[PDB]
Amino acid sequence: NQALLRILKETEFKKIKVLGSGAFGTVYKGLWIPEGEKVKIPVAIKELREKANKEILDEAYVMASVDNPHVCRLLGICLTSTVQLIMQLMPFGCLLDYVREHKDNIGSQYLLNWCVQIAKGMNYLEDRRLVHRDLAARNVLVKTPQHVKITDFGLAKLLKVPIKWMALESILHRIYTHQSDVWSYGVTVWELMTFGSKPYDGIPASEISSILEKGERLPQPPICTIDVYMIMVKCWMIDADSRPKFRELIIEFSKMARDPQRYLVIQGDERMHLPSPTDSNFYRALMDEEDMDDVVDADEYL
Ligand SMILES: */C=C\C(=O)N1CCC[C@@H](n2nc(-c3ccc(Oc4ccccc4)cc3)c3c(N)ncnc32)C1
């Protein structure tokens, strides 16, 4: 579906501010102004650091074809000897920055729900027989605090390797599968549960395969019950086929979401809440009108 990707002229948009800079590229806050109109519409622009345009376009069409509440869809592209990718601007930013900023005051309901949502997005990709190759907290965007979407799908294929998120088989032989995606998902969950901690920090990348072969793993976060830690451990099993499936993960986390205090131990959690319906309705109307499955709420509390 070529209609899904908009080809943008340089004249119809402008980069206004740098939001972040990456090995993959630089991300800018931008404005689209549509031809013949007086409106300036905020957009996010990713300019890749630096394959012919035909190959790039062909990859781009697939990237534009992902349509799920929990995956970000590439909206537009401009090809000018630099590759510029256009998507919605998300004021909330990446999940990783968000958890660090809120590290004191994030509730168990949010964390479990984020786990469900990410799994839902990954599952959609698996169902489509597509592999992300770079799942990480940095690569999840926050639409609203209640709603998160996986981003940068297909970028890894298109283009400093994230060794510390990679499955052993990926590090060793660069084999990427839904099962390697599951491994990355586990690291991502660990990031959330540690409020933005950097996995294997201080361990050189060159040693990572060896420690994994030894069987060393990321440690259990203090907030996590063993039940949650075991799910991460299952994600990092050497035999890829043994690892959990995204469809299973959606169910497990959803179950946990029903009695959060059973599975995550957080100080003052009783004080921290998912939004009331009134608040949720307000957020959706203002900035999140797309259809999504309702957040899983505690059985006790509704
Ligand atoms: C934790 C991530 C981080 O540090 N960032 C730096 C600041 C910007 C932030 N960010 N990135 C995007 C973003 C992501 C992807 C794309 O383009 C795509 C889309 C789909 C597939 C491949 C490439 C563009 C922009 C942000 C957006 N969209 N809004 C707000 N912050 C974004 C990452």
Side-chain angles (χ1 to χ4, degrees), residues 19-21 27 44-46 63 72-74 85-91 93-97 137-141 151-155:
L19 293 181
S21 342
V27 176
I45 301 158
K46 177 174 277 195
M63 291 160 74
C72 299
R73 187 170 89 61
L74 172 72
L85 307 178
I86 294 77
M87 83 168 273
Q88 272 184 332
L89 178 65
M90 317 273 240
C94 57
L95 192 49
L96 177 72
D97 283 359
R138 67 176 163 261
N139 287 348
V140 178
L141 299 177
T151 195
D152 279 337
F153 165 80
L155 206 34

mmCIF file of all heavy atoms in Angstrom, residues 19-21 27 44-46 63 72-74 85-91 93-97 137-141 151-155, ligand 1:
data_model
loop_
_atom_site.group_PDB
_atom_site.id
_atom_site.type_symbol
_atom_site.label_atom_id
_atom_site.label_comp_id
_atom_site.label_asym_id
_atom_site.label_seq_id
_atom_site.Cartn_x
_atom_site.Cartn_y
_atom_site.Cartn_z
ATOM 1 N N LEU A 19 15.657 17.453 19.311
ATOM 2 C CA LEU A 19 15.126 16.787 20.483
ATOM 3 C C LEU A 19 16.122 15.805 21.073
ATOM 4 O O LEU A 19 16.268 15.710 22.278
ATOM 5 C CB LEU A 19 13.849 16.048 20.131
ATOM 6 C CG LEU A 19 12.652 16.901 19.755
ATOM 7 C CD1 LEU A 19 11.475 15.998 19.464
ATOM 8 C CD2 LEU A 19 12.320 17.873 20.866
ATOM 9 N N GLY A 20 16.762 15.038 20.206
ATOM 10 C CA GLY A 20 17.760 14.073 20.615
ATOM 11 C C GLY A 20 18.641 13.678 19.459
ATOM 12 O O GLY A 20 18.252 13.790 18.309
ATOM 13 N N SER A 21 19.835 13.201 19.778
ATOM 14 C CA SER A 21 20.802 12.796 18.773
ATOM 15 C C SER A 21 21.262 11.384 19.055
ATOM 16 O O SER A 21 21.483 11.015 20.203
ATOM 17 C CB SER A 21 21.986 13.758 18.741
ATOM 18 O OG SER A 21 21.669 14.984 19.375
ATOM 19 N N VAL A 27 16.952 13.445 15.970
ATOM 20 C CA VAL A 27 15.529 13.698 15.958
ATOM 21 C C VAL A 27 15.223 15.152 16.240
ATOM 22 O O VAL A 27 15.720 15.723 17.197
ATOM 23 C CB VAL A 27 14.776 12.849 16.980
ATOM 24 C CG1 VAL A 27 13.314 13.237 16.975
ATOM 25 C CG2 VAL A 27 14.948 11.374 16.675
ATOM 26 N N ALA A 44 7.414 15.166 14.197
ATOM 27 C CA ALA A 44 8.730 14.700 14.591
ATOM 28 C C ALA A 44 9.488 14.289 13.339
ATOM 29 O O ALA A 44 8.942 13.642 12.468
ATOM 30 C CB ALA A 44 8.620 13.533 15.547
ATOM 31 N N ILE A 45 10.735 14.709 13.232
ATOM 32 C CA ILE A 45 11.525 14.350 12.080
ATOM 33 C C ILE A 45 12.784 13.630 12.512
ATOM 34 O O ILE A 45 13.504 14.116 13.354
ATOM 35 C CB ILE A 45 11.918 15.593 11.261
ATOM 36 C CG1 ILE A 45 10.678 16.340 10.775
ATOM 37 C CG2 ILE A 45 12.823 15.205 10.115
ATOM 38 C CD1 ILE A 45 10.928 17.789 10.443
ATOM 39 N N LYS A 46 13.055 12.483 11.919
ATOM 40 C CA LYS A 46 14.298 11.782 12.187
ATOM 41 C C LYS A 46 15.173 11.786 10.951
ATOM 42 O O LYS A 46 14.798 11.266 9.914
ATOM 43 C CB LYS A 46 14.047 10.348 12.646
ATOM 44 C CG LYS A 46 15.322 9.550 12.861
ATOM 45 C CD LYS A 46 15.049 8.187 13.462
ATOM 46 C CE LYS A 46 14.898 8.280 14.969
ATOM 47 N NZ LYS A 46 14.993 6.959 15.643
ATOM 48 N N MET A 63 7.346 -0.134 6.664
ATOM 49 C CA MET A 63 7.377 0.622 7.902
ATOM 50 C C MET A 63 6.107 1.440 8.067
ATOM 51 O O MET A 63 5.645 1.660 9.168
ATOM 52 C CB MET A 63 8.611 1.507 7.962
ATOM 53 C CG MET A 63 9.906 0.734 8.118
ATOM 54 S SD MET A 63 11.320 1.709 7.607
ATOM 55 C CE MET A 63 11.446 2.844 8.960
ATOM 56 N N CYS A 72 4.241 2.445 16.452
ATOM 57 C CA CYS A 72 4.282 3.685 15.688
ATOM 58 C C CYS A 72 4.497 3.427 14.196
ATOM 59 O O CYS A 72 5.436 2.762 13.794
ATOM 60 C CB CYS A 72 5.387 4.598 16.182
ATOM 61 S SG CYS A 72 5.254 5.122 17.890
ATOM 62 N N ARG A 73 3.638 4.038 13.395
ATOM 63 C CA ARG A 73 3.631 3.900 11.953
ATOM 64 C C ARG A 73 4.443 5.026 11.315
ATOM 65 O O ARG A 73 4.251 6.190 11.627
ATOM 66 C CB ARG A 73 2.189 3.993 11.467
ATOM 67 C CG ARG A 73 1.964 3.709 9.995
ATOM 68 C CD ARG A 73 0.479 3.598 9.667
ATOM 69 N NE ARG A 73 -0.131 4.867 9.310
ATOM 70 C CZ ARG A 73 0.246 5.608 8.277
ATOM 71 N NH1 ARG A 73 1.233 5.197 7.508
ATOM 72 N NH2 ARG A 73 -0.352 6.759 8.016
ATOM 73 N N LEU A 74 5.355 4.686 10.418
ATOM 74 C CA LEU A 74 6.054 5.743 9.705
ATOM 75 C C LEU A 74 5.045 6.466 8.819
ATOM 76 O O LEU A 74 4.334 5.850 8.048
ATOM 77 C CB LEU A 74 7.187 5.194 8.856
ATOM 78 C CG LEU A 74 7.843 6.217 7.937
ATOM 79 C CD1 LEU A 74 8.688 7.203 8.723
ATOM 80 C CD2 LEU A 74 8.656 5.540 6.858
ATOM 81 N N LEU A 85 12.680 10.944 8.080
ATOM 82 C CA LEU A 85 11.489 10.180 8.402
ATOM 83 C C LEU A 85 10.570 10.999 9.294
ATOM 84 O O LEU A 85 10.984 11.531 10.308
ATOM 85 C CB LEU A 85 11.857 8.874 9.109
ATOM 86 C CG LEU A 85 12.864 7.933 8.464
ATOM 87 C CD1 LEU A 85 13.124 6.740 9.356
ATOM 88 C CD2 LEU A 85 12.392 7.483 7.102
ATOM 89 N N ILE A 86 9.311 11.079 8.903
ATOM 90 C CA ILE A 86 8.350 11.893 9.612
ATOM 91 C C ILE A 86 7.277 11.068 10.314
ATOM 92 O O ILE A 86 6.707 10.158 9.745
ATOM 93 C CB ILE A 86 7.680 12.902 8.680
ATOM 94 C CG1 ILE A 86 8.698 13.917 8.176
ATOM 95 C CG2 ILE A 86 6.545 13.601 9.395
ATOM 96 C CD1 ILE A 86 9.603 13.400 7.097
ATOM 97 N N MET A 87 7.025 11.420 11.558
ATOM 98 C CA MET A 87 5.986 10.800 12.361
ATOM 99 C C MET A 87 5.341 11.813 13.309
ATOM 100 O O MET A 87 5.682 12.981 13.289
ATOM 101 C CB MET A 87 6.524 9.604 13.118
ATOM 102 C CG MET A 87 7.232 9.954 14.403
ATOM 103 S SD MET A 87 7.507 8.459 15.350
ATOM 104 C CE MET A 87 5.986 8.359 16.255
ATOM 105 N N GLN A 88 4.366 11.367 14.079
ATOM 106 C CA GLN A 88 3.713 12.227 15.038
ATOM 107 C C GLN A 88 4.729 12.675 16.069
ATOM 108 O O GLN A 88 5.634 11.942 16.412
ATOM 109 C CB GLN A 88 2.590 11.494 15.772
ATOM 110 C CG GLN A 88 1.222 11.529 15.124
ATOM 111 C CD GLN A 88 0.167 10.850 15.982
ATOM 112 O OE1 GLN A 88 0.473 9.944 16.748
ATOM 113 N NE2 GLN A 88 -1.076 11.289 15.856
ATOM 114 N N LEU A 89 4.570 13.898 16.544
ATOM 115 C CA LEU A 89 5.365 14.389 17.643
ATOM 116 C C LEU A 89 4.712 13.953 18.947
ATOM 117 O O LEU A 89 3.543 14.206 19.155
ATOM 118 C CB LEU A 89 5.454 15.901 17.593
ATOM 119 C CG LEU A 89 6.236 16.555 18.724
ATOM 120 C CD1 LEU A 89 7.705 16.179 18.683
ATOM 121 C CD2 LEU A 89 6.039 18.056 18.719
ATOM 122 N N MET A 90 5.468 13.294 19.817
ATOM 123 C CA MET A 90 4.931 12.881 21.102
ATOM 124 C C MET A 90 5.544 13.695 22.214
ATOM 125 O O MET A 90 6.694 13.531 22.525
ATOM 126 C CB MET A 90 5.214 11.406 21.365
ATOM 127 C CG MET A 90 4.991 10.510 20.176
ATOM 128 S SD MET A 90 3.298 9.970 20.088
ATOM 129 C CE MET A 90 3.563 8.216 20.205
ATOM 130 N N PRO A 91 4.731 14.510 22.858
ATOM 131 C CA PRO A 91 5.217 15.442 23.875
ATOM 132 C C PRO A 91 5.877 14.717 25.046
ATOM 133 O O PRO A 91 6.864 15.189 25.573
ATOM 134 C CB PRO A 91 3.942 16.133 24.344
ATOM 135 C CG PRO A 91 2.997 16.028 23.208
ATOM 136 C CD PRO A 91 3.376 14.834 22.391
ATOM 137 N N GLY A 93 7.650 11.954 25.107
ATOM 138 C CA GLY A 93 8.994 11.462 24.871
ATOM 139 C C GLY A 93 9.117 9.968 25.025
ATOM 140 O O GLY A 93 8.120 9.293 25.018
ATOM 141 N N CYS A 94 10.334 9.451 25.102
ATOM 142 C CA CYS A 94 10.525 7.994 25.237
ATOM 143 C C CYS A 94 10.242 7.477 26.655
ATOM 144 O O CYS A 94 10.352 8.180 27.647
ATOM 145 C CB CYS A 94 11.881 7.505 24.752
ATOM 146 S SG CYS A 94 13.228 8.335 25.620
ATOM 147 N N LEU A 95 9.879 6.211 26.710
ATOM 148 C CA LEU A 95 9.523 5.568 27.946
ATOM 149 C C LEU A 95 10.719 5.576 28.881
ATOM 150 O O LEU A 95 10.565 5.693 30.065
ATOM 151 C CB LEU A 95 9.050 4.143 27.699
ATOM 152 C CG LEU A 95 8.375 3.447 28.874
ATOM 153 C CD1 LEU A 95 7.309 4.330 29.483
ATOM 154 C CD2 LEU A 95 7.778 2.135 28.419
ATOM 155 N N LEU A 96 11.909 5.401 28.332
ATOM 156 C CA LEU A 96 13.074 5.355 29.195
ATOM 157 C C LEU A 96 13.283 6.655 29.967
ATOM 158 O O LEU A 96 13.466 6.625 31.164
ATOM 159 C CB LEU A 96 14.321 5.053 28.379
ATOM 160 C CG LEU A 96 15.630 5.042 29.157
ATOM 161 C CD1 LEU A 96 15.721 3.821 30.055
ATOM 162 C CD2 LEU A 96 16.818 5.126 28.223
ATOM 163 N N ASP A 97 13.185 7.786 29.286
ATOM 164 C CA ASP A 97 13.314 9.078 29.938
ATOM 165 C C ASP A 97 12.176 9.240 30.948
ATOM 166 O O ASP A 97 12.363 9.735 32.040
ATOM 167 C CB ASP A 97 13.266 10.203 28.909
ATOM 168 C CG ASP A 97 14.571 10.367 28.137
ATOM 169 O OD1 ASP A 97 15.537 9.641 28.396
ATOM 170 O OD2 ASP A 97 14.615 11.248 27.270
ATOM 171 N N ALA A 137 13.705 0.239 25.858
ATOM 172 C CA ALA A 137 12.909 1.267 26.494
ATOM 173 C C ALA A 137 13.095 2.604 25.762
ATOM 174 O O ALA A 137 12.179 3.398 25.682
ATOM 175 C CB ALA A 137 13.267 1.395 27.961
ATOM 176 N N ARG A 138 14.282 2.818 25.222
ATOM 177 C CA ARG A 138 14.582 4.010 24.450
ATOM 178 C C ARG A 138 13.710 4.034 23.206
ATOM 179 O O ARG A 138 13.423 5.082 22.660
ATOM 180 C CB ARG A 138 16.044 4.049 24.049
ATOM 181 C CG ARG A 138 16.413 2.970 23.069
ATOM 182 C CD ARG A 138 17.847 3.055 22.582
ATOM 183 N NE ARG A 138 18.233 1.791 21.971
ATOM 184 C CZ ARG A 138 18.929 0.845 22.580
ATOM 185 N NH1 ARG A 138 19.347 1.022 23.815
ATOM 186 N NH2 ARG A 138 19.211 -0.275 21.949
ATOM 187 N N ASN A 139 13.359 2.848 22.738
ATOM 188 C CA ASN A 139 12.626 2.685 21.503
ATOM 189 C C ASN A 139 11.126 2.494 21.723
ATOM 190 O O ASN A 139 10.426 2.019 20.864
ATOM 191 C CB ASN A 139 13.239 1.592 20.632
ATOM 192 C CG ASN A 139 14.548 2.028 20.001
ATOM 193 O OD1 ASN A 139 14.893 3.196 20.022
ATOM 194 N ND2 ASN A 139 15.279 1.085 19.451
ATOM 195 N N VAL A 140 10.663 2.848 22.907
ATOM 196 C CA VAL A 140 9.243 2.938 23.157
ATOM 197 C C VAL A 140 8.837 4.373 23.484
ATOM 198 O O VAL A 140 9.405 4.988 24.367
ATOM 199 C CB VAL A 140 8.823 2.023 24.310
ATOM 200 C CG1 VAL A 140 7.346 2.176 24.591
ATOM 201 C CG2 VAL A 140 9.204 0.589 24.012
ATOM 202 N N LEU A 141 7.842 4.886 22.786
ATOM 203 C CA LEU A 141 7.381 6.247 23.025
ATOM 204 C C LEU A 141 6.117 6.288 23.872
ATOM 205 O O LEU A 141 5.329 5.370 23.862
ATOM 206 C CB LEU A 141 7.178 7.000 21.715
ATOM 207 C CG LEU A 141 8.394 7.189 20.815
ATOM 208 C CD1 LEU A 141 8.003 7.879 19.522
ATOM 209 C CD2 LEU A 141 9.493 7.952 21.524
ATOM 210 N N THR A 151 8.466 2.069 18.730
ATOM 211 C CA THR A 151 8.891 2.901 17.622
ATOM 212 C C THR A 151 10.132 2.372 16.933
ATOM 213 O O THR A 151 10.723 1.400 17.365
ATOM 214 C CB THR A 151 9.073 4.386 17.999
ATOM 215 O OG1 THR A 151 9.142 5.168 16.801
ATOM 216 C CG2 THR A 151 10.335 4.594 18.814
ATOM 217 N N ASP A 152 10.453 2.982 15.803
ATOM 218 C CA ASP A 152 11.649 2.660 15.053
ATOM 219 C C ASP A 152 11.602 1.279 14.433
ATOM 220 O O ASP A 152 12.624 0.697 14.158
ATOM 221 C CB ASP A 152 12.900 2.795 15.917
ATOM 222 C CG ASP A 152 13.367 4.220 16.037
ATOM 223 O OD1 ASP A 152 13.034 5.019 15.158
ATOM 224 O OD2 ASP A 152 14.057 4.542 17.014
ATOM 225 N N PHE A 153 10.414 0.762 14.203
ATOM 226 C CA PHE A 153 10.346 -0.506 13.525
ATOM 227 C C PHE A 153 10.983 -0.387 12.153
ATOM 228 O O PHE A 153 10.730 0.565 11.434
ATOM 229 C CB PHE A 153 8.931 -0.999 13.338
ATOM 230 C CG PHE A 153 8.847 -2.111 12.353
ATOM 231 C CD1 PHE A 153 9.175 -3.397 12.725
ATOM 232 C CD2 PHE A 153 8.523 -1.865 11.042
ATOM 233 C CE1 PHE A 153 9.142 -4.422 11.816
ATOM 234 C CE2 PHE A 153 8.480 -2.889 10.128
ATOM 235 C CZ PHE A 153 8.799 -4.168 10.511
ATOM 236 N N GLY A 154 11.819 -1.363 11.830
ATOM 237 C CA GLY A 154 12.402 -1.538 10.516
ATOM 238 C C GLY A 154 13.651 -0.723 10.274
ATOM 239 O O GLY A 154 14.335 -0.901 9.282
ATOM 240 N N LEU A 155 13.961 0.147 11.220
ATOM 241 C CA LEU A 155 15.149 0.977 11.159
ATOM 242 C C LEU A 155 16.437 0.166 11.222
ATOM 243 O O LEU A 155 17.399 0.471 10.548
ATOM 244 C CB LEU A 155 15.115 2.032 12.262
ATOM 245 C CG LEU A 155 15.885 3.321 12.036
ATOM 246 C CD1 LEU A 155 15.877 3.753 10.584
ATOM 247 C CD2 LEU A 155 15.364 4.420 12.935
HETATM 248 C C1 LIG B 1 14.666 7.658 24.718
HETATM 249 C C2 LIG B 1 14.714 7.999 23.236
HETATM 250 C C3 LIG B 1 15.453 9.318 23.040
HETATM 251 O O1 LIG B 1 16.363 9.644 23.789
HETATM 252 N N1 LIG B 1 15.065 10.072 22.011
HETATM 253 C C4 LIG B 1 15.742 11.344 21.795
HETATM 254 C C5 LIG B 1 14.719 12.446 21.757
HETATM 255 C C6 LIG B 1 13.699 12.144 20.678
HETATM 256 C C7 LIG B 1 12.978 10.824 20.922
HETATM 257 N N2 LIG B 1 12.052 10.604 19.808
HETATM 258 N N3 LIG B 1 12.187 10.006 18.897
HETATM 259 C C8 LIG B 1 11.111 10.057 18.127
HETATM 260 C C9 LIG B 1 11.029 9.448 16.940
HETATM 261 C C10 LIG B 1 11.186 8.076 16.765
HETATM 262 C C11 LIG B 1 11.120 7.513 15.489
HETATM 263 C C12 LIG B 1 10.916 8.313 14.370
HETATM 264 O O2 LIG B 1 10.852 7.840 13.096
HETATM 265 C C13 LIG B 1 10.561 6.539 12.854
HETATM 266 C C14 LIG B 1 9.280 6.049 13.052
HETATM 267 C C15 LIG B 1 8.984 4.728 12.778
HETATM 268 C C16 LIG B 1 9.966 3.881 12.303
HETATM 269 C C17 LIG B 1 11.238 4.371 12.085
HETATM 270 C C18 LIG B 1 11.538 5.696 12.359
HETATM 271 C C19 LIG B 1 10.786 9.678 14.549
HETATM 272 C C20 LIG B 1 10.851 10.233 15.812
HETATM 273 C C21 LIG B 1 10.242 10.863 18.713
HETATM 274 C C22 LIG B 1 9.015 11.326 18.467
HETATM 275 N N4 LIG B 1 8.410 10.906 17.363
HETATM 276 N N5 LIG B 1 8.406 12.148 19.323
HETATM 277 C C23 LIG B 1 9.063 12.539 20.480
HETATM 278 N N6 LIG B 1 10.330 12.028 20.716
HETATM 279 C C24 LIG B 1 10.881 11.211 19.819
HETATM 280 C C25 LIG B 1 13.966 9.684 21.102
#
